[PDB]
Write a protein that binds this ligand. Structure first.
Ligand code: ZN
Ligand code: ZN
Lengths: 207, 211
C-alpha cells in the first residue's frame, strides 16, 4: 500500500530544507576569520548584539580580510538559543557598485523560453543565492518537491561567459538528509560576477 | 505494526513548521486596512518596494487605523514571487522605543511535577507583544532544550499557559497538528492576533506529558 517511497522521502527532505527565509544582509563587517569560519557582525541591522557564523571549506576565508565589508546570503541550517545565525558560505565582497534569463524544459520539451524568474541586485553573488531563488521559483510554480507532483529528477545549468556550463542536481538529497547535509555543498562559497553570467537552463523530468 | 507512529508524524510536522526565520520589523506604517488584512510597509528596511500582508480574523483591523505605526512579528506561511511577506496576525501597536528589557519567568512542569523555574529563556523587547511571538520563541527554546518535537523524546502532550493579571491564564496546545498539517494550517490560529501587555504579564507555565 505504498509506491515510490524513497523519491517521495527525498523530495520531502528537500521541501523542508528550502522553504525558509534566508539570512540576507549587505555591507557587514567581518569581525574575525579562522581557518574555516567567517564571523560577521550584523548588530546594526538587528539593533542588538548579533552575528553570522558562516562555515566554509579550506582556504576560502584566505581571500578575505578582517574588517572588510561583505554581503551575506545564506540559508540557516540550524537554530539555537544564541543571537547567531549559522550558514555555509554565502559571503561576497561589497563592491563599489552594488538581467538573469534562462529556459526551462520538462521531459525534453521547452516550456519556458528566456524567462526572468528571479532577481539579484548584486554585481557579485553566490551560486547559493541563485540556486535558492531558482528552487523557490520551482517550488512555487511547479511544486517540484511536493510528494504528489510528477517531478522526480532535475538539473540547474549555469552558463558563464568564457567557461563551460556548470550543472547542479536539483534533487540532491537522501531520505535521511538534514538541512545541514543538503546545504553543506555551499561551503565552497562558489561565486559569480553578474557581468559574466550568460543564462541558465532548468531541466525537469517525470521519468 | 506501531501504536505511537501518529504522535511521531505529528511531532515531525511541528518540528518542521517551527524551524523557521520569523518576519520581524518594528515601527512600520499601516498603508491600508481591509476587513481581514493589514498591508504594512517595510520598504525602508528592504530598500525597495516591499510589504507585509497580515491576514487576521474579523473585528481585528477595526482596532487599528491607516498610517498608524505597528511592529511585526509573524511566521510566514507561504512564499510567492512577489515582494510581500504573508503572515497571520503578528501586529501590535508601536508605542515607545520598543526596547523594553523586562524579565520573563516561567515554570516548567513534566508529568505534573515542577522541574525548574526558567529565567528569561526567551527575550521580548516590545512592551506590547503577540502570543504568536511568545509561542514561537518558547517552542524554539523547548525544541533546542527539551527536544519536545523529536520523535525519540517521551513528550507526546503539552500545554503552554500565559498568566496575566486578572486571573487570565491563556492556554495553548503545544502538539497542535496532524501528520498532514502544513505551516498555513498550523499558523492559522495566529489570525486572532492575541496580544499581551508586558506590564500585565505575570509568568508562564510549560506542561509536558509523557502519558
Ligand atoms: Zn545553456
Ligand atoms: Zn501559572
Amino acid at each position: 500500500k505504498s509506491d515510490s517511497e524513497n523519491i517521495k522521502d527525498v523530495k520531502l527532505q528537500l521541501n523542508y530544507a528550502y522553504e525558509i527565509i534566508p539570512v540576507d544582509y549587505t555591507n557587514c563587517n567581518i569581525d574575525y576569520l579562522t581557518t574555516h569560519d567567517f564571523y560577521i557582525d550584523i548588530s546594526s541591522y538587528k539593533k542588538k548584539n548579533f552575528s553570522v557564523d558562516s562555515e566554509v571549506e579550506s582556504y576560502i576565508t584566505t581571500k578575505f580580510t578582517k574588517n572588510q565589508k561583505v554581503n551575506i546570503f545564506g540559508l540557516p541550517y540550524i537554530f539555537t538559543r544564541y543571537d547567531v545565525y549559522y550558514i555555509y558560505g554565502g559571503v561576497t565582497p561589497s563592491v563599489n557598485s552594488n538581467k538573469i534569463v534562462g529556459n526551462l524544459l520538462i521531459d525534453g520539451v521547452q516550456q519556458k523560453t528566456l524567462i526572468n524568474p528571479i532577481k539579484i541586485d548584486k554585481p557579485i553573488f553566490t551560486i547559493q543565492e541563485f540556486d535558492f531563488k531558482i528552487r523557490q521559483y520551482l517550488m512555487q510554480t511547479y511544486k517540484i518537491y511536493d510528494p504528489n507532483s510528477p517531478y522526480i529528477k532535475g538539473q540547474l545549468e549555469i552558463a558563464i561567459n568564457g567557461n563551460k556550463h556548470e550543472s547542479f542536481n536539483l534533487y540532491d538529497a537522501t531520505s535521511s538528509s538534514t538541512r545541514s547535509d543538503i546545504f553543506k555543498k555551499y561551503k565552497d562559497n562558489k561565486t559569480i560576477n553578474m557581468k559574466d553570467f550568460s543564462h541558465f537552463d532548468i531541466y525537469l523530468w517525470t521519468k
